[PDB]
Amino acid sequence: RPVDVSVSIFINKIYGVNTLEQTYKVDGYIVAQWTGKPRKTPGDKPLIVENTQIERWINNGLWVPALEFINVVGSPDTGNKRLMLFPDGRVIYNARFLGSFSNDMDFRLFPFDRQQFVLELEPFSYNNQQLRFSDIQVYTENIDNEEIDEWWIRGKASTHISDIRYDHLSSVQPNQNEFSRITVRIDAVRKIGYFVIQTYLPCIMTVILSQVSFWLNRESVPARTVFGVTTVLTMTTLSISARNSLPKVAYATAMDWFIAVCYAFVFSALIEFATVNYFTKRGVESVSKIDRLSRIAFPLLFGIFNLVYWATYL
Amino acid sequence: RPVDVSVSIFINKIYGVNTLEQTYKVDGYIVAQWTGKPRKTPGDKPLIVENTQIERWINNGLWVPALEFINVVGSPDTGNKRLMLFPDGRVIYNARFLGSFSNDMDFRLFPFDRQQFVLELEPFSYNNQQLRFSDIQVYTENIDNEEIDEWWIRGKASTHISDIRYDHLSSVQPNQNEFSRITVRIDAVRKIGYFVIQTYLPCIMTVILSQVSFWLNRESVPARTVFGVTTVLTMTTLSISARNSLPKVAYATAMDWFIAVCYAFVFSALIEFATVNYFTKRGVESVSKIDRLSRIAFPLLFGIFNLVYWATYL
Amino acid sequence: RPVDVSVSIFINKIYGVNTLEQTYKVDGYIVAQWTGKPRKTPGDKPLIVENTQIERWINNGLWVPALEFINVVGSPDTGNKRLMLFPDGRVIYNARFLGSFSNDMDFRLFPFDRQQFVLELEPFSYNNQQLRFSDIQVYTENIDNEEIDEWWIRGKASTHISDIRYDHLSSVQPNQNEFSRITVRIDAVRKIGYFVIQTYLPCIMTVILSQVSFWLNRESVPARTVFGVTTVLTMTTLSISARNSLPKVAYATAMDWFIAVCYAFVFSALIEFATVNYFTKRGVESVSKIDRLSRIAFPLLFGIFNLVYWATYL
Amino acid sequence: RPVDVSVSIFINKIYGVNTLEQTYKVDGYIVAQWTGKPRKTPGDKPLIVENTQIERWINNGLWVPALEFINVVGSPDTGNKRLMLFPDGRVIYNARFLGSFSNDMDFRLFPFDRQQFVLELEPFSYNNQQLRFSDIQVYTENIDNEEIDEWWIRGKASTHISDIRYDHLSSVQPNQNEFSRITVRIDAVRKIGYFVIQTYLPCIMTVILSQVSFWLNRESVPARTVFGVTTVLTMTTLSISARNSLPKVAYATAMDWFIAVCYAFVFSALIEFATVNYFTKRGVESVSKIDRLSRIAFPLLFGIFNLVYWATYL
Amino acid sequence: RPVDVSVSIFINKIYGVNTLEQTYKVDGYIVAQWTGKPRKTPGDKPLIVENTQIERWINNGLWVPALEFINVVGSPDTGNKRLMLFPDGRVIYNARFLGSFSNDMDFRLFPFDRQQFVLELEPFSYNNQQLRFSDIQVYTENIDNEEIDEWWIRGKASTHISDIRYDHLSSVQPNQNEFSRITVRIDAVRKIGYFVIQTYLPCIMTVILSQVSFWLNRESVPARTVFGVTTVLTMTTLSISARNSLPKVAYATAMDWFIAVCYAFVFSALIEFATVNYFTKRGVESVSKIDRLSRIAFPLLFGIFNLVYWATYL
Ligand SMILES: CC(=O)[C@H]1CC[C@H]2[C@@H]3CC[C@H]4C[C@H](O)CC[C@]4(C)[C@H]3C(=O)C[C@]12C
Ligand SMILES: CC(=O)[C@H]1CC[C@H]2[C@@H]3CC[C@H]4C[C@H](O)CC[C@]4(C)[C@H]3C(=O)C[C@]12C
Ligand SMILES: CC(=O)[C@H]1CC[C@H]2[C@@H]3CC[C@H]4C[C@H](O)CC[C@]4(C)[C@H]3C(=O)C[C@]12C
Ligand SMILES: CC(=O)[C@H]1CC[C@H]2[C@@H]3CC[C@H]4C[C@H](O)CC[C@]4(C)[C@H]3C(=O)C[C@]12C
Ligand SMILES: CC(=O)[C@H]1CC[C@H]2[C@@H]3CC[C@H]4C[C@H](O)CC[C@]4(C)[C@H]3C(=O)C[C@]12C
């Protein structure tokens, strides 16, 4: 007695990925097919009914169940609606949907993170005892496979049919509070190219600039201080601007750890000079022993770190 | 004589918390049940009517009271609507809502503040003598309890039913102008991580950078002045950029007072040096005992301050 | 014969004040009551008609005039609509409105300006010979009077009813082209707290920083120049950023005049040092009497200026 | 035989002028009058039909032509619609329109440019052989002439009626593809106040700051270089921030030409100083006559430049 | 047997080009003509039916196929709709559309890139066996083919009719899953004027400013370091700010390569100075012949680069 419903979804385009609001817009077509009671169409041809004329048919008792996207931010922009009325009884609901979808996202591996563009479809007013999803096949490719859209699509779609228990229907439907839900997931990874130029490389070149102070002398204090404060302030601002593209989360990202280390070498380089200025009297010949090793200690310490960093997270 | 109305609300997700406009977006379901006049349904099953077809029923005299969200910023995004028509008379109104809600917020303890995500539900056109809310049940935790949405959810929801007197309905029914209101509150706390990295740490290291001037000498005036002006201006920009994440309120926040203190230590450090620069010839051997104590007075005075700060506000 | 219309407006909240666009958002309820032909309702109770069911009544010749907000930025967000049909004949139209309103604003006294949140209500299609507004009652205080909205509400509402002559209907209604207009005004004053921290204090501490150049010496020219250019440029950036919260108006504001002075003292301080640097050899012993007096002349001129400033504008 | 249609347009307000998108919002009323078949109204008074009830009238065969704004960005925000049915036959369509309009704008004389706020009105589905505009009257002044937000309304309105030939209807209407078009233009001039405060004066004072380097000496190279690099970079950023209030046009504006000159004097001052530093020993007694003459050439050239500039462009 | 449909599209204006979201807004009219079943119109004149009155015709069984824009971001802003019903059977659907369209764009040649503003029109519910596009005519030139605001339109439109195979109808339409698709392309080139003034010229003069350091001496280290760090940091910010007008793509643009080169000359000049500072005692006469030659090597190396750069990419 539960209505077996076959569902096919074609994803036309994915766009408007917003990491801040954790939303992403999905455009495509939807198809809902179920075998109902036979009817006599005008002619043996299948009857096709478009947007407005569908209302007159449900007014004559036609059964069209409302389907609902769960992980959506607002009522999706529904396009044109059509109805395929076959003589053997099978009904086919086809329409285009453009909605702003949401999904929980973890940024602990920013910007090397992997996230899932998920579609959560599930009917309304009809539980698993009344309406059941037979199968789901997502014909996303032939368009999707173009993955130069600010992300990298890795793998095909994943379809799964599950049963969700809503407790807020228990007061009204005893033991009838489970709904069949279709879930479609597409794994994707981020493209680190944009962030290398905005934060990573500016962090590196700032570190390179910060360490030039070692190679000057016990020279004009203005010079080695200007090198210090400019690199510290520059590294300070980059630490701020690097998170403006991220939600106000608590955990630290791989970009955060990279900045803190790059912050350390920059701040240490200044204190190193500030150290030899208090020890300008204890052991001064032409150059101290700190600079003679800091000119090599700092770059090598920083160099191997980048090797550990980029070898990881990749 | 007033109709007892049982209300159940299932919150799908809370998102889009905007501290500036003091809004927050809430998605979820609503259930409204009342006992009406008995009817003879087609079959013994309860009759289920979906979005558009409900309008035809109220045209035949069916009574569906309009419910209204008070603390909303604009007309909420109403999803799919359904009606459960039982033969014994009881009617059940179930629909999905996605709205931008508002609530009075106090920012005196920024960013350690506690706020409440509130839903204020109340009917339209029907007072408490005509329509009464029997009970309210919020089955929010099942989903909501995952709070990585820029805030920290601490505790379950609190439900309360009250009666509100609108004076602008006195003109039509004297003394019968009170409306039943359902109120749903969810306490929440902020995640200070983003603010630690964006303002607090940059303020601290700037203060740390400001105090390196002490450990130099009565040295090149350019150096110790560059330390002064850069740190003062840096602290000045941070004082401004720290408030762009807040509405144009009048009272000062815990972040504000914390910056003013960090502002004091930076400006005092410059004047401290600017003082010893006025005494460069009267009593100069190597160090002004002022600097010899400022190298210890400033960190300890600032160090104990952070202990006074973080012990408070927590 | 003109229909006397009683109007009551309940303001739920005023929010979203945008000084740039000179708009402001207003949420609340509206009530329009007029005496029609008597009828016999079902029971002596008043007949209540909700959103959609109004269509059936107005199609049957019921007279429900549409009321129109003049000073609105776009088509207001109409909430739920209701109709109270009384048996004694009086008809009552009640609905909730959320609209983005506009009003001409003068910003010559930024941020000490006084502005008016105005509602200009007036019907459509019905002149004063056909429809006249009897009285207006603004039930704003019950909620509004808690002035926590980036502004301070100073006083209750002020109502004015007038007759407006539209010349573009003279070609169609000779001498019958006057419309009854309801006007609701709420005076308000601005909260200078946000601007004290963003512009005033950074301007002041910059001026304080600008004068430290005097207390150095005829010293290292780099230092007193670094004090000079940084303070001028800092004051220049603050002079620009201070108007980004204002429309691109022509007249100068009280904040503008205050900055120009703060710009003058800072730029004068640099020119002063550049002057004593031109007199570095002709008449040099230890200090130019200019510095001996500028350390007192400038603060006294600056001190009395702020006192004259804040005594005014308040 | 073509239907003569009298048109009256009342402009309520012009607001939201965006120079970047070259759009502008116009709110007001519209009146369309044509003489139809006589009718018998209830009483000799004209019959008035409001927003929804018009649909029933056009459903009964009444001829109400849809009017269309050409230079609009999206479907304009249509307010309330009314219908005046006169007994002598003349029909009057009156409604309120709030739309975001567009017009080609030339910015070669930024910020002294002159622009026109244009309304291009033209019917749909009815050509000039079917519908013709008799006359047009724009009752704009009553309100409009008060402009306080970035522009100056200078002069009255200009009305013109024309016939436009669309070639894309020849396939559907051979030789009958011309539509009557109403065009309303309002000249306006820009208010340079905002730009004087944001760029022009800051450009001037920066140029003034650039020339103080002359009055120092062949002095501490840090000072006169700090004068050089800081002024060059400051003038560089102002050239950037000056165009963010403009679309990405190709031609250079009067503000651009003004900045390029101000850019030259700033960079020339550095090269001038950098020149005398290359000649510090070959022909040195006390001062390089270059600075002694640059102190007069530079201010006079800049002063006379503003005279050539501001005598023009005004 | 498939209905041949003639389609004409008139593009009124192209506006709102957003390179970030890769969208662009298109306003214009559409004409769809097909020869249908003969009918008896009132009079021999063609019957004209406007927006609302069309619904009654399709309600009486008239066949109006829904047409669909593929490369659209959301449900487009549909204007006024009209229907021409001819007695010989031919039906004509004419309407105005304003939609936000999208197209894949390649930014490797920023800002010398050439892009295509594409419209993808294709019907719904009717395959190529039922509805076929006979021909397409784009009458765009009348208001185009000259140039647009931020881009240059070069050439007339390009028309393409194709057959698109959707695999998601195979389960419901075996071998009948091909749709006729009209595609309209407009080639366009970018206007580099805005980018020359905003990034290129500031990058060039910054390199020029960086090279003045050579012409000082083995002089005050503060000066040549101030030249060094300021130019390096300035060039660093320009590398970031130049990409804020681009999506987060992975590939590097022609603007990126130009900045990286400009980054080298600035950074190389600093290392060059940092080299001669290491040789202040080891091989010192007055100047390191490196600086004596770098004053010629760098400009010529930079000069020839600009010739290679701008000769390319054009
Ligand atoms: C012997 C030595 O190398 C000296 C030279 C500079 C000094 C530091 C300067 C900045 C100081 C800020 C605050 O006073 C805390 C302490 C702080 C980090 C100092 C020290 O630990 C001692 C340092 C490192
Ligand atoms: C004698 C001495 O060592 C000098 C060095 C720095 C000087 C201060 C700099 C800032 C000044 C601002 C305004 O002129 C009021 C006075 C003000 C606070 C100065 C003084 O108290 C005197 C100081 C402490
Ligand atoms: C003798 C003396 O005290 C010198 C020190 C600073 C100099 C001024 C610096 C700013 C200059 C701007 C422009 O070059 C015009 C001239 C301008 C006002 C200079 C002077 O007239 C001479 C001044 C006042
Ligand atoms: C002899 C003289 O006074 C020197 C001092 C500063 C020098 C200029 C500084 C900027 C240089 C940029 C690039 O290195 C090309 C060359 C460039 C324009 C120099 C010159 O032609 C020679 C100048 C004017
Ligand atoms: C021999 C010579 O001319 C010196 C002058 C400047 C020095 C360089 C400055 C920047 C340094 C950054 C980090 O310390 C790694 C090493 C780094 C590249 C230095 C060196 O290789 C040695 C240089 C080239």
Author numbering:
A (entry chain B), B (entry chain A), C (entry chain E), D (entry chain D), E (entry chain C): 10 to 199, 222 to 316, 388 to 416
How does the study describe this entry?
Alphaxalone (5α-pregnan-3α-ol-11,20 dione) is a potent neurosteroid anesthetic. The structure of the α1GABAAR chimera co-crystallized with alphaxalone shows that alphaxalone binds to five equivalent inter-subunit sites close to the intracellular end of the α1GABAAR TMD. Residues within 4-Å of alphaxalone are from TM3 of the principal subunit (A305, T306, Y309, and F310) and from TM1 (Q242, V243, W246) and TM4 (P401) of the neighboring complementary subunit. The aromatic ring of the conserved residue W246 is parallel to the C ring of alphaxalone, establishing a ring stacking interaction that potentially stabilizes the binding. The pore profile of the α1GABAAR chimera desensitized by alphaxalone is similar to the pore profile of the apo chimera, except that the most constricted pore is located at P253 (−2′) in the desensitized structure. Relative to the aligned structure of the apo ELIC-α1GABAAR, the alphaxalone-bound structure shows 1.3° inward and 0.18° outward radial tilt from the pore axes in the ECD and TMD, respectively. The alphaxalone-bound structure shows a small counterclockwise twist (0.80°) of the ECD and a clockwise twist (1.37°) of the TMD around the pore axis. Alphaxalone binding to the bottom of the TMD introduces structural changes, including the orientation of W246 in the TM1, presumably to optimize its interaction with alphaxalone. The change passes to the TM1–TM2 linker and further to the TM2, particularly at P253 (−2′) and V257 (2′), resulting in a backbone RMSD of 0.95 Å for the residues covering from W246 in TM1 to V257 (2′) in TM2. The structural changes further propagate up to the ECD–TMD interface and other ECD regions, as evidenced by the observed RMSDs: 0.66 Å for the TM2–TM3 loop (P278-T284), 0.61 Å for the pre-TM1 (R199-I223), 0.58 Å for the β1–β2 linker (V26-E30), 0.63 Å for the Cys-loop (N112-F126), 1.01 Å for loop A (N80-S84), and 0.84 Å for loop C (D172-N186).
